[PDB]
Symmetry: D2
């Protein structure tokens, strides 16, 4: 009776479904898949990428960047929501093939450096190739590329280094406040009395408040269904999208119900 075989991170079919670039604002594009958000922001001095999806999406992301006229060497910076395998997967390969730099906070940087291994909740079950962050980001720090300013908003919970990004784009000249907020879920976590995360509940409750106050005219999430996006319908993709208030309220109601049956 030997030891078990290693089992790989298998995801739903719609997470790996390629899609053509979908426009969000004058310079913001969804270039990921139907169920995974990968945002491209084109400026006069280069492109910015927010998240990348699964590790095997590196080639697809470069094809869609090429469809927008963005050569690999034009990618200047990669920003992250959190350093899990389904959102930072191809970061290591994208650095090698584009020469871009990665900016993240300290908690995301150390988790990224070990490829998601020794996760506080998942252990070594969901890993990916390691990557190193080039610039360390503080809460409220502004990152400017080509005139577009990105502001980091720490929201610890789903991971200690979970981060929301806000920036102002335009819609045919008129401004729009875009907010890319991270997950507020706890899929299978031990909430109360967790030895690896003693203040997990306090961090979550504060993040709910942080997301409510975010300056936002249009909300996007790493998983589009969390904010009621439907990338498949194209022009009507943002029709039923949620507000920052509604998104945070629904997350707290699910978090409270999960916390209630954990005591049971």
């Amino acid at each position: 009776a030997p030891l078990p075989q290693l089992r790989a991170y298998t995801v739903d079919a719609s997470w790996l479904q390629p899609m053509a670039p979908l426009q969000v604002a004058d310079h913001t594009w969804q270039i990921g898949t139907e169920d995974l958000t990968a945002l491209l922001v084109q400026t006069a001095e280069g492109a910015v990428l927010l998240d990348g999806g699964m590790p095997q999406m590196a080639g697809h992301l470069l094809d869609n960047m090429k469809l927008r006229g963005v050569a690999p060497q034009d990618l200047r910076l990669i920003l992250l929501s959190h350093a899990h395998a389904d959102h930072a997967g191809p970061v290591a390969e994208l650095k090698r093939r584009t020469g871009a730099h990665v900016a993240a906070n300290a908690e995301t940087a150390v988790l990224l450096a070990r490829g998601g291994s020794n996760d506080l909740h998942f252990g070594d079950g969901i890993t990916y190739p390691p990557a190193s962050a080039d610039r360390i980001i503080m809460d409220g720090e502004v990152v400017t590329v080509g005139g577009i300013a990105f502001t980091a908003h720490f929201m610890p919970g789903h991971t200690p280094g979970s981060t929301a990004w806000t920036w102002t784009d335009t819609r045919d000249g008129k401004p729009v406040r875009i907010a890319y907020a991270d997950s507020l879920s706890a899929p299978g976590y031990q909430l109360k009395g967790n030895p690896r995360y003693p203040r997990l509940i306090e961090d979550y409750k504060r993040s709910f408040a942080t997301v409510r106050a975010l300056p936002c005219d249009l909300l996007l999430t790493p998983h589009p269904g969390a904010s009621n996006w439907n990338y498949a319908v194209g022009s009507k993709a943002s029709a039923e999208a949620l507000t920052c208030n509604a998104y945070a309220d629904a997350a707290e109601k699910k978090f409270d119900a999960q916390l209630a049956r954990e005591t049971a």
Copy 2:
């Protein structure tokens, strides 16, 4: 007219003044210098070191460990207050010569990994040999060695990863609550509108509250004069030491006065 010569980190004379081990409790010893705190905690399964002082103190710390019957291979773990040159200096050398592991939080880990360079306030002016943290610590996490439990209390401000450590020792059998709190000073910092640390003031104000509530019968600081310790007088070294309440109150009054004349 050439470029200026590199200038080294020169400190006061009493920071580099060797002293013999001074006893604090049944298992807690000050083995640093007169003006730099380096705490040794002896257990049944090995020794724990909290801070190390200046980089050139590595040999002195091993001599004092030897005076307590602690061989180098008996040092199991190094804990840190914050990763500045005058307190984490010899950590890299101590790892090589003892085989100990280093535990710190993510912010201290990334600053330790780059030897204090690119400091948020000091730049590259005060550097030291880099060292890597082996175990990443969360706020409120308990670290146990030989039955003695160490609890981490995050107190960001002096550095983003500043940390206070609490543990219970004994004084001839009766328990005593020891608290090793980090610095609450801002020597030359830009407090308001700092681009590298946008929420510096909010972090400081919360840390003042954190230090007030710490479970503490006896307070020690990385610089002994900050808590009114005088290591030179030996038996009367703790006579005039401050409480956690008094230490936090004096720090906030100096921080408020500095913040008031910064607006001027």
Copy 3:
């Protein structure tokens, strides 16, 4: 038509077959599986581990160490043949649970740090949790633990940082020269004109010569079948084992035949 699912590193059944500690010399023990070598060397100042096998073998290795009276904190050092998943797999977990240090050369250190990803030949196909080396080793450097001296012999080829380890043990008082030589195979490699390894052939030919000259009375390999070991038969396990000369000769004949049909 979506993107393919990630597939995990599946190995043969006998690679994951637990076995009880088998004695090799007075202080050298095989504590891995039937088809994966993990050598434990017990000294008066602690234990040394050479290789660890697959990532899921961490718990089994600690059980066998416990069977020899070796507590986890007694493991002082981990040495490696090469940093592939089937031999350095559990190194990251073993560091966390034992407080041991890892010593390897620069090439093995950088491959270990990225968990085997971006392999020169395998890419990201065979990964494992990353680990950092604590001490960097030069060719011919001696590592001493508890009086037993380990000498490193660089043999680049299978990986750039492939290393052979030699040390002298005893067999009921009389000395024996043990040599733990790495793999000399090229499973599916592109030998000629490889852009990632331009001098692959020159490195292999020199390693064949290095293994022939190794001081060796008894040869062991990471895969026991390569040196004609049969861990399953216990007392007769070393009966048919090869010499350093025979092992290197057979490797060069297979390497030359593979190089001949690559030109075809």
Copy 4:
């Protein structure tokens, strides 16, 4: 009687003497100081920098890049001879301010990562801010930027990761083979029986042979005086420069004389 003060790395006056860009070929420029070589290579897809000099030269290098029409974001790649403080000094700062990537071999990468500390010969005496290599380079590997191909030639000795770089430029249309060879000196090293570098002599002797065979019409060294360059005279700077044969021959004669009086 306290512990000694830290002393900084003070160099000669001519090492920190700024100079205007001096042309070497159609695309190769010396933009360092009079006694420190920093080579800029301009291509159609960006610029390449070879070495940077002392840490305090970062601002000067960007001024000279600006004089050639090279914006910071146009710097694509930094190559290194060896990772000592007087040649890799400003690499960490240049990465932050340009978004360039660093390519080096494994030995240079690990020394660069610890800021030159724990040097095999100098210890912690000559340190600098740490930097991480983005791409790991093998011996004989070709690095292409904008059509210009750079070939790495390992020459261990001065440091284990010492590297020579060769590329073909033009002189008003006609080709010229440029070779940037590292130092072949051993300033104060222990050559025979060195525990940190057991095969130091063998590595040096092989490097002398490597430098003799380098394809070279024009030789440059990190210290210009080693190859008889005089950057101060401008147009006649290369008049008395040495060949690869003469440079290697003089290094071996000085190495043999030093090795002879070490036995004394």
